[PDB]
Amino acid sequence: FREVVETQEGKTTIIEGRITATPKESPNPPNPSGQCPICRWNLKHKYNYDDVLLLSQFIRPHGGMLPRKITGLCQEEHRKIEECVKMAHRAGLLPNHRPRLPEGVVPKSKPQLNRYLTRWAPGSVKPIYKKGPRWNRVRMPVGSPLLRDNVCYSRTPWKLYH
Amino acid sequence: GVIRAIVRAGLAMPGPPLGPVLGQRGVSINQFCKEFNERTKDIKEGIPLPTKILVKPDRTFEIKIGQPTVSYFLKAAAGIEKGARQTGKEVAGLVTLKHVYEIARIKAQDEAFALQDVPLSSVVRSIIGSARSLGIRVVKDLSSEELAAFQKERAIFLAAQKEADLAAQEEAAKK
Amino acid sequence: KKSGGSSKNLGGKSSGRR
Amino acid sequence: AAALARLGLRPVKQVRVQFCPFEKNVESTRTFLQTVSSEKVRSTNLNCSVIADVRHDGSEPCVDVLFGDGHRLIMRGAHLTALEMLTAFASHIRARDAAGS
Amino acid sequence: FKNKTVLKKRCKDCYLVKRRGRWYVYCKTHPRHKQRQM
Amino acid sequence: ALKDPDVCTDPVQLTTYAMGVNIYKEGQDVPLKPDAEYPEWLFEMNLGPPKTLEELDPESREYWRRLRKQNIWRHNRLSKNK
Amino acid sequence: VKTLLPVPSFEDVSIPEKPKLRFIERAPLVPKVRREPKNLSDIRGPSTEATEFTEGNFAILALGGGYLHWGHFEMMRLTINRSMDPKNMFAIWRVPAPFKPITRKSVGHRMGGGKGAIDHYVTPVKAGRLVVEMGGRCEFEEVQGFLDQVAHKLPFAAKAVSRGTLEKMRKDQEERERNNQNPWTFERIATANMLGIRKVLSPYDLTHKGKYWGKFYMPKRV
RNA sequence: ACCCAUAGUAGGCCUAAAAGCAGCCACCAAUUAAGAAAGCGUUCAAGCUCAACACCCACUACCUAAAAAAUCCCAAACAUAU
Ligand code: FES
């Protein structure tokens, strides 16, 4: 990877770029014919929001996603890994990939509400004051429909609406 | 700001459209007149001249003028006073390759073609295309007798045009 | 409430001939 | 750049672009020259110099910016992108203006 | 804002963003173009 | 009172001189050099309608420039009503 | 180095003398006297008329059944004539003028007392019919915009189609009927009265094969 | 998406004037390339985009878009063990 450093000395600023150590794909992918990193390692349909060892390899130090052209992911798996990282952040599973805070700002405290499988941004959802009849019931989404094709080891498929 | 307007030599007037444009930008019209008419003394009055008023701080204007429009050149060289009303259906003039070649020699001297340093053939190609829009057909060789015959027929067609205009005025009178 | 009209088609009451 | 033309080269006084075009890591520095050489950007401040110190010695490309206040900005473009330079360059223009006033 | 079921950019500075769970049209040039998803 | 300037109309003169080429009052209407004094390609110039794509060579400049104009003609046409 | 491609040439297409859509009258020339039954079967099921292109290259395809009244023709005409290029485009009607009489009773009347009086006229349209046909020196992109506007304002589901999009639309439906991996199809079950299913089906369902429900067409059904 | 824009010429005709952009016809030429012009514009002007050139890949998925009533929401819940 590549860094950028700005050092100001004697009213003079010097902006440079250094090349740091770079990781490399582990040798012998179980499926070298795979197109994207996922299919090359027989990982399609086999990861979830809690598999951070996988998800942490496709995000920036501050929790942002990395571009598809750089990672090489298929457009499809990019959307799965993108949703999975959104949910992993909201589950408190990426406690080091936190947003950069300018000028040492100390955020005001928030209520701790543990959560998992959170499809929507918490501040963006309204209360369900009128649940509606049983034949038109306003449901609560759980998980993501992007992961519907994940391998299900139970005879019942994932329920995405509670 | 560069002001572009094809004006006639020595006929600058304070009235529109020249006036309002100059006044809006603050350029003195009287100052323009004093310079223009003096700079247009050796040129035949009434000649359509593409001008280029290089207005610059503070309202300084260098009136650089180029060769007359190629429309003028061709229309005058064909002996007609107006252009074709519907070109492609009405041939209002005839010229030879020699007439076009010599007009190119004068028009190539214009700053527009001179700055491109193009061969004369390229400029000649431009004249032919511009001619086909004015109704003038370029011919390889034309005799004085061939032009006289056509001109006689051309008078008949031109005369009938006047009568047609009167009929249109009657219909416009009701509207 | 509203005065209504009447059908203008009479007859047509014969039964099938078997 | 659009933001660079809107902001202008007002505070800048001399911009020197040095590179060895026969090298393989000057594309960013050569791109930096293209954007600043525009009639748009140069017009914002005609006095502001734009020099092209083309060399062939092997030194990494450099961009030297001299402000009217006397401050200097040195961007070593060997491992920098043109976009990174223009964002950094615009930041100093926005900064030196506030420092003076 | 005007509430709209179909959001249409009216210009070239009119940009589409999703905030608060719905789509918006914000235009800094022509504020009269601002739309809200209904 | 305002009209266009004078137009020469003498048939023979019109055919013996390039009228209007003299723009200087003292200048003289330019007589026409003879055939020999002109290059051969002048009489090989295309005085008719432009060559079509079939007539043009697929490896020539004019061909592609003509094709480009047609592509632009279309673009304008299919955006007129958008 | 953009790769230019040839453009189609419109030298094999002539424009009719009257490219615009003619005016459509509200009611027929001679008024009808005999009042007619409701006859709702005339917007039910697939169309067997005006299902193919004749002169032009683009059209509005009806994706459902319904009745066109005069207000629809006025909307079709003014929108098409105002939006077409008369020099390079022509437009022909593919539906007849309103001919089916529609009766209404006086306001506030009770049931009974004989049938009501003829009120207006309509034109029945079945799904799969061309409503209006266009052609000329244009591509589909040029007309698709405002043909979609008029189609969206029709009393049934409709869509602007081309000589080509119509064909691929039909190839896709036949492709689906062939690669359908479901061993159970509506037709198979309903033709064999499997499960005694005809106790809930119409006789018409033997030919509609589950693609039609009243006047509605379902292009997803195979 | 990013960029980028010179030139015969304000093509004639029409019109008080029309200059790419009233309406009329025609739509050829310059340079590697830029429509007698697609959208905006004005004083008919000028201006601002788009279509070209150059650099060179933006990523573009697939079709899509909604809601309100009156006593008090309405089982509780749940994405994971064949
Ligand atoms: S998972 Fe194989 S193409 Fe993306």
Q: Is residue B164 included in any domain, yes or no?
A: no
G37 interfaces chain C, CB cutoff of 8 Å: no
Between CA G37 and CA D22 the distance in angstroms is 90
Per the omega criterion (within 30 degrees of 0), is the bond before G172 cis? Answer: no
A85 membership: H or E segment, kind and range: helix A75-90
Residue nearest to nucleotide H2 (CA to C1'): D1
Q: What subunits touch chain F, counting only 3 or more CB pairs under 8 A?
A: B, G
Do B79 and B62 belong to one domain? no
Together in a domain, B42 and B100: no
Residue D13, both tokens: 């006084």
Does E touch C (3+ CB pairs < 8 Å)?
no
Resolution (angstroms) stands at: 2.4
Q: Are D72 and A11 inside 8 Å of each other by CB?
A: yes
CA distance A34 to B6: 69
| D78: contact with A, CB 8 A cutoff | yes
Identify whether residues B49 and B71 lie together within a single domain.
no
CA-nearest of A16, A123, C5, G98 to D28 is A16
Unique residue bearing structure tokens 């009347």: G109
Q: Is D75 on the interface with A (CB under 8 A)?
A: yes
- Residue B125 resides in a domain: yes
Q: What angle do CA F54, F60, F63 make, to 5 degrees?
A: 45
Tell me the DSSP string of C1-18: -------------PPP--
Nearest by CB to residue D79, choosing from A12, A13, A17, is A17
Ligand 1 mean position to A28 CA, how many Å? 17
* Number of neighbours of residue B123 by Cβ within 10 angstroms: 23
Q: Note down the domain range covering B78.
A: 67-140
Pairwise CA distance, residues G42 & G210, whole Å: 18
G80 in Cβ contact with G132 (< 8 Å): yes
Q: What is the CATH number of the domain that holds B114?
A: 1.10.10.250
Shared-domain flag, residues B61 and B106: no
Question: Is A36 touching ligand 1 by the criterion CB < 6 Å?
Answer: yes
Mutate to test the interface with D, among A1, A5, A16, A18 (most CBs of D within 10 A): A16
- For Cα atoms G188, G200, G126, give the angle at the middle one, nearest 5 degrees: 75
- Assess if residue B134 is contained within a domain: yes
Is B61 within the bounds of a domain?
A: yes
Which chain G positions have a beta carbon within 8 Å of C7's beta carbon? 113-115
Please indicate, yes or no, whether residues B41 and B71 belong to a single structural domain of this protein. Answer: no
Contact present, B97 and B139 (Cβ < 8 Å): yes
A67 min Cα distance to partner chain D (Å): 17
DSSP 3-state percent helix, strand, coil across chain D (nearest 5)? 45, 25, 35
State whether G142 and F78 contact (CB < 8 Å). Answer: yes
**Which tokens go with G176?**
């689906």
Q: Return the ligand 1 atom nearest residue A74 CA.
A: 4
Asked if the structure places residue B174 within a domain, the reply is: no
Query: How many beta-carbon pairs below 8 A join chains C and G?
Result: 19
- Asked whether the beta carbons of residue A15 and residue D75 sit closer than 8 angstroms, the reply is yes
Contacts of B80 in chain F (CB under 8 A): 7
Interface contact F80, partner G, CB < 8 A: yes
- Give the whole-angstrom CA distance, residue F39 versus residue A57: 74
Residue of A nearest to D75 (CA): A15
B165 in a structural domain: no
The answer to whether position B84 is within a domain reads: yes
Q: Which of A161, A14, A10, A147 is nearest to A79 (CA)?
A: A147
B93-96/B136-139 β-pairing: parallel
Give the closest residue (by CA) to ligand 1 atom 4.
A74
Residue among D70, D73, D76 whose CB faces A16 most closely: D76
Which one, of B150, B145, B21, lies nearest residue B80 by Cα?
B150
Looking at the fold, whether B49 and B75 belong to one and the same domain comes out as: no
**Are B107 and B57 in a shared domain?**
no
What torsion do the CA atoms of A101, A105, A110, A115 make, to the nearest 10 degrees?
10
**Domain tally, chain B:** 2
From ligand 1's centre to the CA of A35, what distance in Å?
A: 5
Q: How many angstroms separate the CA of residue F63 from the nearest CA in chain B? A: 16
Specify the 3-state DSSP secondary structure of A20: coil
Using the CA of F80, which nucleotide's C1' is the nearest one? H38
Would you call F56 an interface residue with chain B, using a CB distance cutoff of 8 Å? no
Let me know the angle formed at the C-alpha of B148 by B151 and F18, rounded to the nearest 5 degrees.
95
Show which residues on chain A lie within 8 Å of chain D, measured between beta carbons: 2, 4, 6, 11-19
Q: A144: phi > 0 → left, psi -120 to 50 → alpha, else beta; which?
A: beta
Nearest-neighbour CA in chain E from A124: distance (Å) = 5
**Which residues lie across from E27 on neighbouring strands?**
E14
Are B77 and B127 found together in one domain?
yes
Determine the Cα–Cα distance for residues G206 and G187; give it in Å rounded to an integer. 7
Q: For residue D5, which of D30, D37, D47 has the smallest C-alpha distance? A: D37
D16-42 burial code (b ≥16 CB/10 A, e <16): ebbbbeebeebebbebbbebbeeeebb
Mutate to test the interface with C, among G103, G104, G106 (most CBs of C within 10 A): G106
d(CA B79, CA F20): 10
3-class secondary structure, B56: strand
d(CA A64, CA A61): 7
Q: Is residue B175 part of a domain?
A: no
Structure tokens at A106: 């100390």
Q: How far is the CA of D31 from the C1' of H55 (A)?
A: 9
Q: Touching check for G6 and chain F: CB below 8 Å? A: yes
Report the alpha-carbon distance of residue G150 to residue G73 in Å, rounded.
10
Last residue of one domain, picked from the residues B41, B66, B91: B66
Q: Are residues B71 and B60 in the same domain?
A: no
Pairing of strands E22-27, E14-19: antiparallel
Q: Name the residue among D38, D60, D59 with its Cα closest to residue D50.
A: D38
The CA–C1' separation of B17 and H44, in angstroms, is 9
Does ligand 1 have an atom closer than 6 angstroms to the CB of A38? yes
Q: Can you tell me the distance from the alpha carbon of E24 to that of G68, in angstroms, rounded to the nearest whole number? A: 37
Give the nearest chain C residue to G113 (CA atoms): C6
Torsion, CA G109, CA G111, CA G114, CA G119, rounded to 10:
50
What kind of experiment solved this structure? cryo-EM
Physical contact, G and C (3 or more Cβ pairs within 8 A)? yes
Distance (Å, whole) CA F47 – CA B142: 14
Instruction: Give the Cα separation of G187 and G222 in Å (integer).
Output: 9
Q: How many CB atoms sit inside 10 A of residue G47's CB?
A: 18
Same domain, B73 and B58: no
Edge-to-edge strands, sheet with G66-68 = G66-68, G117-125, G100-104
- F77 and G142: CB-CB below 8 Å? yes
Q: How far is C5 from chain G (nearest CA, A)?
A: 5
Which of residues 1 through 18 in chain C touch G, CB cutoff 8 A?
1-2, 4-9
Same domain flag for B61 and B79? no
Spatial distance between the Cα atoms of B97 and B131, rounded to a whole number of angstroms? 12
Residues in chain F with CB shorter than 8 Å from the CB of B140 are 43, 47
Contact yes or no for A7/A14 (Cβ under 8 A): yes
Q: Which nucleotide is nearest to B80 (CA to C1')?
A: H12
Task: Tell whether A127 lies on the interface with E, counting CB pairs under 8 A.
Answer: no
Torsion (CA) G187, G193, G196, G200 in degrees, nearest 10? 50
Max intra-chain CA distance, chain E = 24
Q: In terms of domains, do B74 and B134 share one? A: yes
Taking CA atoms only, the protein residue closest to ligand 1 atom 1 is A39
List CB contacts (< 8 A) between F29 and chain B.
Answer: none
Q: Which residues of G touch C8 (CB under 8 A)?
A: 114
Two tokens, residue A3: 């860094």
Q: Which atom of ligand 1 is nearest to the CA of A43?
A: 1
**Residue B51, domain CATH:** 3.30.1550.10
SS (H, E, C) F10-31: CHHHHHHEECCCCCCCCCCCEE
Question: Closest chain A residue to E23 measured between Cα atoms?
Answer: A124
Q: Nearest 5 degrees, angle CA B68-CA B70-CA B75? A: 105
Going by C-alpha positions, the residue among B127, B113, B40, B112 that lies closest to residue F23 is: B40
Q: Does B144 touch chain F (CB under 8 A)?
A: yes
Between CA G120 and CA G70 the distance in angstroms is 9
Mutation choice for D interface testing from A6, A9, A15, A20 by most D CBs within 10 A: A15
Written as six digits, the tokens of G51 are 């299902």
Final residue belonging to a domain, choices B38, B66, B94 = B66
Q: Which nucleotides of H are covered by protein (CB under 7 A)?
A: 3-5, 7-14, 17-19, 24-39, 43-47, 49, 51-56, 58-61, 65-66, 69, 73-75, 77-82
Contact G30, G24 (CB under 8 A): no
Q: Which of G6, G139, G146 sits opposite F78 (nearest CB)?
A: G139
Residue type, B95: V
**The two three-digit tokens of residue G135, written as one number:** 């052609």
Q: What distance in angstroms lies between residue A26's CA and the mean position of ligand 1's atoms?
A: 18
